[PDB]
From a paper:
PchD activates salicylate, PchE and PchF successively integrate two l-cysteines into the growing peptide to form two thiazoline rings, and PchG then reduces the second thiazoline ring to thiazolidine before the release of mature pyochelin. The adenylation domain (A) in PchE selects and activates l-cysteine; aryl carrier protein (ArCP) and peptidyl carrier protein (PCP) connect and transfer salicylate and l-cysteine using phosphopantetheine (pPant) arms, respectively; the heterocyclization domain (Cy) condenses and cyclizes the two substrates to form a thiazoline ring; and the inserted epimerase (E) catalyzes the epimerization of an l-cysteinyl moiety to d-cysteinyl during thiazoline ring formation.
In conformation 1, chains A and B are identical with an r.m.s.d. of 0.037 Å. In particular, the D240, P370 and S448 residues are in the range for hydrogen bond formation with the pPant arm atoms, and Y114 can form a polar interaction with the thioester sulfur. These interactions position the salicyl-pPant donor in place for the condensation reaction. In the thioester-forming conformation of conformation 1_chain B, the aromatic residue F741 in the A4 motif51 was observed in two side chain conformations with a rotation angle of ~68°, similar to the H207 movement of 4CBL52 crystal structures.
Author numbering:
A (entry chain B): 7 to 1340
B (entry chain A): 844 to 996
C (entry chain A): 538 to 690
C-alpha cells in the first residue's frame, strides 16, 4: 500500500536523518528532502535499503525528485516494473590470500608508479593534531590494537592486488620525543618531519598502509599525526580509525568488536551486486566516451608529466559554523545537497580558471553499501570513483547552476557503478587521453570529520594533507567543529606559484557570498579583485590621442617646413612641401572625379612617392583610402572593390570603364591642388585595409582617423619620433603598419625611406637604404626583420636604427638577441600586438632584454587609449594566467568592416565595459599584468608575416572548376610554407550500362586456388606456432573450408595457376620467415609470392588479365609521348611481372601508393625510366592532377576503405578524355584469403562488378568491362573534363590570391579526413602536408 | 564597503565644489556610477553609486535576499549598489550627490526613515507613519502618524 | 571609461590578514606601549592584548567559535576595545551595539544576527542570546594567541 510504503520511507528517513518518526511523517509528499537535510550519503543508504527490499531504484530517480511523493510514485511503479536485487554473493574469499583491488584502489595503486603521470605518490592522508600531553605508550598500544582489530589497516599491496597480513613487519607508531630539544630546533625538525611524512610513499608493499605518529615538542605540546594510505581506508574509514584510536587511547576496554565483514568478502559481494549496474554504466560511458570533456584546462606552470615527485600544498579555509549553517539553509531552500553546493562552486571556479567550461572531476563517492550494518565500522577503502562530467553554464544564477550540477552528479552516481578508472582506461584504449586530475571529496556527514571519541582525547584536526596521485587539485571538505573545512590539496609547482592561492580565495569568496547572499545571483564568479584592478589599470591608460584627422600632422609639418625631406626613394628624395603639393593635387583631382568626404578610394600603386602622395590626397580629399598592392590579382581586386564599395581606384592606369572608375595617379598629379585638406572629423573613416576573409570574400577593416591617430600618438609619444628620424616603409600599403609609417612618421616630421616595388621583399635593398639614409626607425612584421638580419652585419649595417617596431606576427625570442648588437646603442625594440581591426596596434612590449620565463614575446601593456580583455567563450573576463579570447577595445578600434555589418556585429561586440573587437587571438594575462598572446584557435594564420585566413585559400580553391572542397594549412619546416588539399568533384552521371564477356573463367581455377591454399596451409600448419591463436584457429578451419573439404582437386592446380613446386616452396619459406621475423603485416606486401595483389596477378590467370589491361596504351600506335599512372604499385610486384612489355616506346610511367617504403621497394625492383611518387599519408601531389592519359589499378581497389576513394583518386589523376584501367576481385581468391589474414584485413571488401560500375559512374567515369568477369573483372572507363590540372590550379590561384597566400605546395585527396566532431581534420591534414614536403 | 571607499584630500576647497566630493576610490576598491538599469553612466551624469572591490561586506548577516538586491554582480564584478546618487567629473573626481531614498543622516549617524516609520507603525493605534529630516539649524528628525480607529458597527 | 578604470583599479594596499593581527603583533613587539587612553587610566598594548585574550578564552569556554557572531554591548572604554579584540581573537565576529540601544531593537538585532553571545556588563545566560559579563570574561584563561582566522572570515 502507498500509505504503508510511506510509513516505511518515514522510518528509513528517520533512521538516516536522525529525526523523529512522527516529524518525518509530517513531511509533505511534495516536500524536498534535501530541504529536510538529506544528503547523497544518506540517500545512497536509502537506495540500498530500497534495493534490499527489492524495490530497486536508481539514485538518479530518487535524487532528481527527492520528495516523498515522487519516491512513493516511483516505488509503486517499481514494485511491478522493477526486478529484485537478491544476488547470491560468493560465500567467502580467503581472508589471508591476495585479493583484487577496488577500482579506486587500482587507481591509487597505479599512481605509485614513478613513470605514472603525476604519480610517484602514496594517495595517503596526513592528519595533524595538537594536544598538550598524551602518553606515547597508550598511543602505541592503541595503534597496534586498531591494526589487529581492522584487517585492512594491516593490508599489504602487491602486483595490483591486496593481501591482509596477520601482523605487518614494519613499525606502526612513530614516536619522536623532542622534549629535550630547543623550541626553534624542535619546530624546524617538526617542519622537516611534516614535509617528509606528509608526502611519504607509505610502505604499502610491506603492509604499512597505516602509520600513526607522535612528536613531543619541548613547549609542552604533543602533535599527534596520522599518515594513512587511502589504498587501505576511505576518508570515512579514516574517521572511523580516528574514533577507534580515541577509544583505544582513552579506554581500549570500550572497543566494542572487531568488525567481521572482511574487506575481500565485501569486494566480492559488491562486485556481484553491482554487476548489472556495472554493465549498464559501462554502456553509458561507452556511449559518452568520445564526447567526454578533457581535464580542467587550468593554468599549468609545469606539465604534470614533468613532475617526478609531486609535493602537495594544502589551501585551507575553515568555514565558520554560521557560514555552514547558512549554506545548509540555502541549499535546503534551493532543494540541493550541501555537497552539490560545494561541488558546484568548485566547478564554477574551475570553469572560470579553465579554458573550457566543460571538464571532468573525480568525485569519490561514499560506497559503503552492504547488507551488514557493521560495514559502517570497517576501515577499508570503500570509496568508488565517479568520473563526473560537469558542463558549467555561464550567465545563470547560482541556483540554476547548483541545481544543474546536482542533477548531473546524481545522474552520474548511478553511472559510477562503472568505475572512473575503467572509464579512463577505455579512453586510453580508444585513443582518448582524457583524465580527471581534479578531485572533489565532500566528507560532509554532520558527526564531524574528527569523531568525538578522538576529539576528547586529542584536539580537532589542526592540519592535513592529501597525496592523491594523478590529481592536480584534490579538493576536500571536512566537518571541522561544526563548520566546514575547505581544503585544496594542490600540487606544488604544478600550477603557477600564485595561482592556487588566488583560485582558492575566489572559491572561498564565492562560498561566502553564497552564505551571505541569495543564490539568484550570477554563478559567474568575479575576477579576483587584484586581477581586475590590474587589468583596469592596463586598460585605462589615458589616450595620447590629440583627436584629429589622420592627415593633419603631415600637412602641419609640410607648412612648417616644406623643404624638409619627407620621402626617400631609389635615388630621389621628396620634401614635405613637394609631397603635400602632390597629395593636394591628387585630392583636387579626386574631388574633380566625384570623390567626397568618407568615400572609399582604392590605392593600387607600386611602392614609392606617388603611392604616399595618393594616400595623402585620398585623406586630404576627405576620402578613405583602400590600399591594394599592385600585385593584387584581378579577381580578388574586383572582390575587394565590390565589397568596399569603392568610389574610385587610384592606379597607374586610366580606365573609367573599370568596375570602379580607375584613374592614373600621374593624371591626378596634374589636377589642381586644393588650398588645404578637406576638413574631416576625426571619427571619419581613414582606411579600409583589406584583411583576408574566412568565407573567401576579402574583408575590409574600416579604420577611423580617430583610431589610427590614437594608436599613432600612443606610439609616437613613446618612440619620441621627431624630424631627424627616418623610417623604412618595408610594410606594404595594404598592411596597416604602413599607416604608422606614412602618417606617423610624416606627422612627426620623420622622413620615410620607401623601398621600390622591386624592393618590396629585398633585404639587401633594405640594408642599403638604411645605411645610405641613416634610417632610425624600423617598422614591420618580424618576418621582414628576420629576413633583414639574415644579412651579416658587415653586409648590412643597422647601427643607425634608434628604435624598432615589430608586430602583426610572432617576434621570435632570439630576435632581440640578434637585434641589440645590430641596431643603435640604446636598441629600443618594441613588440606590438593586436589585429588590423584595432587601428594598427594595441599592445607594446618593450624588449630591452628577454627574461627566461617568456615562452614567446608577450603582448605588453595595451597601448594608451586602448585596452585588452581576455574572455571565456561566453564573454566573461578570464582570470590571470587563464587562456581566453583576446578582446581589444578603446579609441583605436576600427569603425567595423566596410560593408559587412553582420561580421562587424559578430566581431566588434559590446559589453558593460564597452566596445570590443573579439580578435579570435588566444592569450592570457599574467600575474604582473603582462598579456601573453598564445596564437590562434582558428583559420587566421601568418604567412611571410602577412595575414591570411585559411578559409580564404580554401574558398579560392573551391572556386576552381572541378573542386568539391579544400583544406589549407601552414606547414612545418624552416620555410613555414602555406600548403593545401583538394577534394575533386567528379560530376556523377548515369553510366551504369554494362556488358560482360564472362566466357573465360572456369570453376577449375577456384578448385586450383583451393588446392594451392591446401598446400600453403599445410606448409605453415606444420610450423603453426609462428601464428597467433586466433590465426591458428582460422587457418585450421580454412584447411578444410577453403582448401580441403570445400574444393578438393588434383595437383593440376599448380599447372593452372602457374606457380609450381619451387614457387610453393618459396611461398612457404617466405611466409615462415615473415611470421618468425615479426615483419608482418607490412613485409607481406614486399613479397611477390605472398602479396594479395601479386598472387592475384598470377593465380586467377592474373598475368593474362595484366596483359590485356596492359593493352589500350596507345603510345606505340600513336607514336607520341603518353603518361600512365598506377595507383596500386606497393612493391611493384605484378608490375615486376609485366614491366618488360609494359614499357612501350614513348611511355612515361608513374607509380603511386599510400606508402613510402613499399614504393621504395618498387623503385628498387623496377627500371629507372619509371617515375615514383608516394601518396604520403594518403596525400596526392597536385602536380599530377590531370597529368596522366591512363590510370591503372590492379586487384587492390577493394583494399581502399571505399571504392569511391580510389575511383575519385583515379578520376582526378586522369587527364580529360583519359581512360582508367582497372582489374578488381569480385570473388574471393583462397590464397588471397591467406594473404589478407596475414594482413588481418576483412575479405568483405569485395563486391560484384555491378556495384563497382555503379560507384565508378558515381565517380563520373564511363566504364566498359572487357573479360574474365567473376574472378578478375577488367574494367576500363573514360574520364570526363573534371577541369583539374596543376597548370589550371596555378592559374586560378594567380587569379584569386596574391603570391603571399597561394599554396606553394598543392595536394589532392578523394575526401577530407574528419575530426571527432565531424569537422575537417585540419591538424591531420597539416601534418600530412608537412610529411609530404619531405 | 568595509568602512570607507573614497578619499578626497582637502588641502584647500576649490570654488567649484558644491559639496566636498568623494575623491578617488581608496586603493583596493572602486566606484561605479550607474543608471537604474545598471549600465555605467558617463561623466557628469547623476547615477547610483556602486562600490566594489576587496572592501565589500560579505553581505548582510541573515538577509540573503537583501544582499542579492544590494550586492549585485556584473561583468565588472561585485558591487554594493548603495542608493547614493552621484556623478564622475571630467577629472575623475566623484561628486556624491546625496540620496534619492529613505536612508538619511541624523547627528552624522545613519537612519533609514522606513525604520522610524515602521517603529511608529509598531505602536498600538498607529495605521501608517511618515518620517523626515527637517530644516533649520537643528536638522531635527521628525515624523507623522496615521491613527487606526478600530472601525465598528 | 579609461579614467574610471584607473580610479577603480588602484592596487589593493591590503596585506590580506585577519583584522586583529596587527594589534597583536604590536603588542608582542611592544607590550609596554600605550594602547588606550581613558578618563585617567591608560592601557598598554600588552595589557590590552592580555585582556582581549582572556576575553577570547572565556568566549571559547562559553562555546564561541570561529566566525560565530558575538554581540558587544559595553560602555565606551578599555573594556569595550578588549571585548572586540577578544571576539576577533576568539575567531568570532563582533556585533557592536551601543549600551544605549533599546531592549526591543536589541532583541531584533540579536535575532537577526543570530548572535552566539552578547558581551555586556550583565551576566544573564537566560537572555535571548547568552549574555555574559565582560568582567567575568576578563577573569577567563588567556589564549596563547588569537585563533587563526582566514582573512575572508
Ligand atoms: N599589422 C597587423 C596588426 S599588428 C595586421 O594587420 O595583421 P594582423 O593579422 O591583424 O596581426 C597579426 C594577427 O596576430 C596577432 N598579432 C599582432 N601582433 C602580434 C600578433 N601575433 C604575434 N605577435 C604579435 N606581436 C593579431 O591580433 C592578429 O590576429
Ligand atoms: Mg590580422
Amino acid at each position: 500500500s502507498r500509505t504503508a510504503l510511506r510509513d516505511w520511507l518515514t522510518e528509513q528517513l528517520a533512521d538516516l536523518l536522525g529525526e523523529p518518526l512522527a516529524d518525518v511523517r509530517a513531511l509533505a509528499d511534495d516536500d524536498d528532502l534535501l530541504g529536510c537535510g538529506l544528503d547523497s550519503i544518506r540517500l545512497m543508504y536509502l537506495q540500498e535499503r530500497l534495493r534490499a527490499r527489492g524495490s530497486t531504484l536508481d539514485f538518479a530517480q530518487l535524487a532528481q525528485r527527492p520528495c516523498l511523493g515522487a519516491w512513493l510514485d516511483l516505488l509503486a511503479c517499481a514494485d511491478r516494473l522493477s526486478a529484485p536485487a537478491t544476488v547470491a554473493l560468493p560465500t567467502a574469499q580467503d581472508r589471508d590470500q591476495p585479493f583484487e583491488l577496488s577500482s579506486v584502489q587500482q587507481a591509487y595503486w597505479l599512481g605509485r608508479g614513478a613513470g605514472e603521470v603525476l604519480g610517484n605518490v602514496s594517495c595517503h592522508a596526513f592528519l595533524e593534531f595538537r594536544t598538550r600531553d598524551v602518553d606515547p605508550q597508550r598511543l602505541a598500544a592503541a595503534a597496534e590494537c586498531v591494526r589487529q582489530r581492522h584487517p585492512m589497516l594491516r593490508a599489504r599491496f602487491l602486483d595490483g592486488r591486496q593481501q591482509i597480513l596477520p601482523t605487518p613487519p614494519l613499525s606502526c607508531f612513530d614516536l619522536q620525543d623532542w622534549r629535550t630539544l630547543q623550541v626553534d630546533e624542535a619546530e624546524r625538525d617538526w617542519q622537516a618531519l611534516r614535509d617528509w611524512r606528509a608526502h611519504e610513499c607509505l610502505a604499502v608493499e610491506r603492509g604499512q598502509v597505516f602509520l600513526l605518529g607522535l612528536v613531543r615538542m619541548p613547549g609542552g605540546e604533543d602533535r599527534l599525526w596520522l599518515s594513512l594510505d587511502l589504498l587501505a581506508a576511505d576518508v570515512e574509514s579514516l574517521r572511523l580509525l580516528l574514533a577507534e584510536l580515541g577509544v583505544a587511547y582513552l579506554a581500549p576496554e570500550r572497543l566494542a568488536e572487531p568488525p567481521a565483514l572482511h574487506f575481500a568478502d565485501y569486494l566480492a559481494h559488491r562486485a556481484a551486486q553491482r554487476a548489472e549496474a556495472a554493465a549498464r554504466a559501462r554502456d553509458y560511458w561507452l556511449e559518452r566516451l568520445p564526447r567526454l570533456p578533457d581535464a580542467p584546462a587550468l593554468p599549468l606552470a609545469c606539465a604534470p608529466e614533468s613532475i617526478r615527485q609531486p609535493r602537495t600544498r594544502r589551501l585551507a579555509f575553515q568555514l565558520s559554523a554560521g557560514e555552514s549553517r547558512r549554506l545548509e539553509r540555502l541549499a535546503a531552500q534551493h532543494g540541493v545537497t550541501l555537497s552539490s553546493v560545494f561541488g558546484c562552486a568548485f566547478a564554477l571556479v574551475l570553469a572560470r580558471w579553465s579554458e573550457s567550461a566543460e571538464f571532468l572531476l573525480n568525485v569519490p563517492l561514499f560506497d559503503r553499501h552492504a547488507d551488514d550494518p557493521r560495514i559502517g565500522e570497517v576501515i577499508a577503502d570503500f570509496t568508488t570513483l565517479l568520473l563526473l562530467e560537469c558542463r558549467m553554464q555561464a550567465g545563470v544564477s547560482f541556483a540554476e547552476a547548483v541545481k544543474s550540477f546536482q542533477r548531473n552528479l546524481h545522474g552520474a552516481i548511478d553511472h559510477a557503478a562503472f568505475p572512473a578508472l575503467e572509464v579512463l582506461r577505455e579512453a586510453r584504449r580508444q585513443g582518448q587521453p582524457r583524465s580527471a586530475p581534479v578531485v572533489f571529496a565532500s566528507n560532509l556527514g554532520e558527526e564531524g570529520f574528527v569523531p568525538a571519541a578522538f576529539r576528547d582525547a586529542f584536539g580537532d584536526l589542526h592540519d592535513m594533507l592529501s597525496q592523491t596521485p594523478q590529481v592536480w587539485l584534490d579538493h576536500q571538505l571536512y566537518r571541522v567543529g561544526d563548520g566546514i573545512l575547505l581544503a585544496w590539496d594542490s600540487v606544488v609547482g604544478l600550477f603557477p606559484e600564485g595561482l592556487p592561492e588566488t583560485m582558492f580565495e575566489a572559491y572561498v569568496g564565492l562560498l561566502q557570498r553564497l552564505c551571505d547572499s541569495a543564490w539568484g545571483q550570477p554563478a559567474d564568479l568575479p575576477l579576483p579583485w587584484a586581477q581586475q584592478a590590474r587589468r583596469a589599470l592596463l586598460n585605462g591608460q589615458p589616450a595620447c590621442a590629440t583627436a584629429r584627422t589622420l592627415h593633419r600632422d603631415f600637412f602641419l609639418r609640410a607648412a612648417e617646413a616644406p623643404d624638409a625631406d619627407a620621402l626617400l626613394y631609389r635615388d630621389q628624395r621628396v620634401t614635405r612641401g613637394e609631397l603635400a603639393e602632390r597629395a593636394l593635387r591628387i585630392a583636387g583631382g579626386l574631388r574633380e572625379a566625384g570623390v567626397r568626404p568618407g568615400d572609399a578610394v582604392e590605392v593600387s600603386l607600386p611602392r614609392g612617392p606617388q603611392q604616399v602622395a595618393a594616400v595623402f590626397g585620398v585623406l586630404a580629399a576627405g576620402a578613405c583610402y583602400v590600399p591594394l598592392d599592385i600585385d593584387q590579382p584581378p579577381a580578388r581586386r574586383r572582390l575587394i572593390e565590390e565589397a568596399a564599395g569603392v568610389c574610385l581606384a587610384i592606379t597607374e592606369e586610366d580606365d573609367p570603364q573599370a568596375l570602379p572608375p580607375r584613374l592614373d595617379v600621374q593624371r591626378l598629379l596634374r589636377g589642381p591642388a586644393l588650398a588645404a585638406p578637406v576638413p574631416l572629423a576625426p571619427q571619419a573613416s581613414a582606411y579600409v585595409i583589406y584583411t583576408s576573409g574566412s568565407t573567401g570574400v576579402p574583408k575590409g577593416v574600416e579604420v577611423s582617423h580617430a583610431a589610427a591617430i590614437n594608436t599613432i600618438d600612443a606610439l609616437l609619444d613613446l618612440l619620441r619620433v621627431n624630424a631627424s628620424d627616418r623610417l623604412l616603409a618595408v610594410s606594404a600599403l595594404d598592411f596597416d603598419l604602413s599607416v604608422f609609417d606614412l602618417f606617423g612618421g610624416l606627422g612627426a616630421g620623420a622622413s620615410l625611406v620607401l623601398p621600390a616595388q622591386e624592393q618590396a621583399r629585398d633585404a639587401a635593398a633594405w640594408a642599403e637604404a638604411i645605411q645610405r639614409h641613416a634610417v632610425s626607425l624600423w617598422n614591420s612584421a618580424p618576418a621582414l626583420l628576420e629576413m633583414a638580419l639574415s644579412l651579416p652585419a658587415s653586409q648590412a649595417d643597422y647601427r643607425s636604427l634608434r628604435a624598432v617596431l615589430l608586430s602583426g606576427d610572432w617576434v621570435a625570442l632570439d630576435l632581440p638577441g640578434r637585434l641589440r648588437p645590430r641596431c643603435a646603442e640604446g636598441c629600443r625594440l618594441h613588440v606590438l600586438g593586436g589585429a588590423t581591426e584595432a587601428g594598427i596596434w594595441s599592445n607594446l612590449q618593450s624588449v630591452d632584454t628577454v627574461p627566461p620565463h617568456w615562452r614567446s614575446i608577450p603582448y605588453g601593456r595595451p597601448l594608451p587609449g586602448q585596452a585588452y580583455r581576455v574572455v571565456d567563450t561566453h564573454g566573461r573576463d578570464v582570470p590571470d594566467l587563464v587562456v581566453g579570447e583576446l578582446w581589444i577595445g578603446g579609441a583605436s578600434l576600427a569603425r567595423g568592416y566596410r560593408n559587412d555589418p553582420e561580421l562587424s556585429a559578430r566581431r566588434f561586440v559590446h559589453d558593460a565595459q564597452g566596445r570590443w573587437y573579439r580578435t579570435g587571438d588566444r592569450g592570457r594575462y599574467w600575474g604582473d599584468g603582462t598579456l601573453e598572446f598564445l596564437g590562434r584557435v582558428d583559420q587566421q594564420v601568418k604567412v611571410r608575416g602577412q595575414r591570411i585566413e585559411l578559409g580564404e585559400v580554401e574558398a579560392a580553391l573551391c572556386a576552381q572548376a572541378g573542386v568539391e572542397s579544400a583544406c589549407a594549412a601552414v606547414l612545418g619546416g624552416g620555410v613555414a610554407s602555406l600548403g593545401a588539399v583538394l577534394v575533386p568533384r567528379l560530376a556523377p552521371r548515369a553510366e551504369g550500362s554494362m556488358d560482360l564477356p564472362a566466357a573465360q573463367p572456369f570453376a577449375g581455377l577456384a578448385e586450383a586456388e583451393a588446392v594451392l591454399t591446401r598446400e600453403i596451409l599445410g606448409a605453415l600448419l606444420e610450423a603453426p606456432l609462428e601464428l597467433d591463436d586466433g590465426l591458428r584457429r582460422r587457418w585450421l578451419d580454412w584447411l578444410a573450408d577453403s582448401a580441403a573439404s570445400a574444393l578438393p582437386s588434383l595437383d593440376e592446380a599448380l599447372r593452372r595457376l602457374g606457380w609450381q613446386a619451387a614457387g610453393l616452396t618459396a611461398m612457404g619459406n617466405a611466409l615462415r620467415g615473415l611470421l618468425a621475423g615479426e615483419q608482418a603485416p607490412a613485409a607481406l606486401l614486399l613479397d611477390p609470392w605472398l602479396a594479395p595483389q601479386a598472387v592475384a596477378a598470377r593465380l586467377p590467370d592474373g598475368r593474362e588479365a595484366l596483359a590485356r589491361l596492359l593493352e589500350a596504351l596507345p603510345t606505340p600506335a600513336a607514336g607520341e609521348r603518353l603518361r600512365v599512372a598506377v595507383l596500386d604499385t606497393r612493391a611493384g610486384l605484378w608490375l615486376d611481372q609485366g614491366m618488360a612489355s609494359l614499357l612501350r616506346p614513348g611511355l612515361e610511367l608513374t607509380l603511386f601508393e599510400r606508402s613510402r617504403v613499399l614504393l621504395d621497394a618498387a623503385a628498387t625492383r623496377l627500371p629507372e625510366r619509371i617515375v615514383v611518387q608516394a601518396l604520403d599519408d594518403g596525400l596526392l601531389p597536385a602536380e599530377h592532377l590531370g597529368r596522366y592519359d591512363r590510370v591503372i589499378s590492379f586487384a587492390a581497389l577493394h583494399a581502399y576503405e571505399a571504392s569511391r576513394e580510389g575511383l575519385a583518386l583515379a578520376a582526378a589523376l586522369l587527364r580529360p578524355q583519359g581512360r582508367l584501367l582497372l582489374v578488381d576481385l569480385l570473388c574471393e581468391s583462397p590464397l588471397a584469403l591467406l594473404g589478407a589474414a596475414l594482413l588481418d584485413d576483412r575479405p568483405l571488401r569485395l563486391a560484384e562488378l555491378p556495384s563497382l560500375l555503379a560507384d565508378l559512374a558515381a565517380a563520373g567515369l564511363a566504364p566498359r568491362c572487357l573479360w574474365r568477369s567473376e574472378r578478375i573483372a577488367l574494367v576500363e572507363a573514360l574520364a570526363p573534363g573534371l577541369g583539374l590540372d596543376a597548370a589550371a590550379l596555378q592559374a586560378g590561384l594567380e587569379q584569386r590570391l596574391p603570391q603571399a597566400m597561394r599554396p606553394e605546395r598543392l595536394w589532392c585527396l578523394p575526401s577530407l579526413p574528419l575530426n571527432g566532431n565531424g569537422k575537417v581534420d585540419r591538424r591531420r591534414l597539416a601534418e600530412s602536408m608537412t610529411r609530404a614536403l619531405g
